[PDB]
């Protein structure tokens, strides 16, 4: 099929975003950090320079995919994956 490759049809994973010191997001396993930062900005009317996505107080790289975050930091743990974001 000519469009079976769209991200539309990828497996989905569930995230919870709490503010570093509450939102729930589902996306493709191939969605990258930069895309999720992209989404926060619109919701908060901010610019990427001022939104950072973190896990265990480490900023995650923009090109890492949700599935790599999950398997390196969340394997064996139930949904959803808990991530932090900060505003600076």
């Amino acid at each position: 099929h000519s469009k079976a490759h769209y991200y539309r049809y990828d497996e989905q994973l569930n995230l919870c975003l709490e503010r570093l010191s509450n939102k729930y997001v589902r996306c493709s396993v191939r969605a990258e950090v930069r895309h999720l930062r992209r989404v926060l900005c619109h919701r908060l009317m901010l610019n990427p320079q001022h939104v950072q996505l973190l896990f265990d107080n480490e900023v995650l790289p923009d090109h890492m995919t949700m599935k790599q975050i999950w398997l390196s930091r969340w394997f064996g743990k139930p949904s959803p994956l808990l991530l932090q974001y900060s505003v600076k």
Partner: protein, 105 residues
């Protein structure tokens, strides 16, 4: 070919990536019983009121097989006669109270 994100202030139903037919590519589905419970609608009213939503069935062993290969679902998270499914699409997500956002790559 863009990314679509589902957003909500409350936890979201689980979806499962399944190929329901040799004639269709894999895509995402909800458990039909979960969509009804969130909506507080009966199967009858849901299908009468929203006929364009796709409801399909697959054997319980075929569903568990396609879902057991995931490294994301844990044993406890794996459900499992048949299993009833409604397809994952923006219209159903908005009905469930979520917002949709399309992010380009």
């Amino acid at each position: 070919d863009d990314f679509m994100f589902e957003l909500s202030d409350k936890p979201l139903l689980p979806c499962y990536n399944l190929q329901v037919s040799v004639s269709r590519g894999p895509c995402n589905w909800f458990l039909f019983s979960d969509v009804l419970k969130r909506l507080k609608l009966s199967s009858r009213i849901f299908q009468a009121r929203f006929p364009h939503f796709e409801i399909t069935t697959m054997p319980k062993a075929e569903f568990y097989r396609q879902v057991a290969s995931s490294q994301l679902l844990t044993p406890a998270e794996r459900p499992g006669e048949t299993v009833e499914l409604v397809r994952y699409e923006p219209d159903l997500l908005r009905l469930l109270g979520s917002e949709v956002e399309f992010q380009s790559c």
